[PDB]
């Protein structure tokens, strides 16, 4: 696995890298839901439900990332 | 085994480029109405994560080789 060739150096840095990528992946998802509503491929109500559920998940990742960064001595 | 660091870096950049085009292709297929939503949300999310993992590892390996 090429993914395994360069990795963070300790479990907490791995957690931080996973939180960074998950939060970004959710923003990507929310952005294209907004683009799908403008194109009319989803309707308003299914749009607001998934954005709500995705934004709830992104808060938990963001709050966690704050705790992880402070526990590791990184800027916050 | 014994691949050069620049060879490993070419591999990883190529693996990042594949997932980016994969997820980009998924995205327009979904904006075209060609892909159902609850399919998209799970798989695109899961693939975007790996795309961001690879962007980071690419930047770290690039700075290792000292660009």
């Amino acid at each position: 696995d090429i993914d395994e060739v360069i990795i963070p150096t300790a479990p907490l840095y791995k957690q931080i890298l996973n939180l960074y990528a998950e939060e970004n992946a959710i923003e990507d998802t929310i952005f294209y839901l907004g683009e799908a509503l403008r194109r009319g491929v989803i309707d308003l109500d299914v749009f607001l439900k998934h954005v709500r559920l995705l934004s709830r998940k992104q808060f938990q990742l963001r709050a966690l990332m704050q705790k992880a960064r402070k526990t590791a001595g990184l800027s916050d | 085994s014994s691949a050069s660091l620049e060879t490993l870096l070419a591999l990883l950049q190529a693996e990042g480029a594949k997932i980016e085009e994969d997820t980009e292709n998924m995205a327009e297929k979904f904006l075209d109405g060609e892909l159902p939503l609850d399919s998209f949300i799970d798989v695109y999310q899961s693939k975007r994560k790996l795309a961001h993992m690879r962007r980071v590892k690419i930047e770290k390996l690039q700075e290792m080789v000292l660009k």
Partner: peptide
């Protein structure tokens, strides 16, 4: 930078190692 949405600069002090 601390916010993941402001780019990969958020990962600047995160150490990586080869294997």
């Amino acid at each position: 930078n601390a916010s993941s949405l402001y780019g990969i600069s958020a990962m600047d002090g995160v150490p990586f190692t080869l294997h």
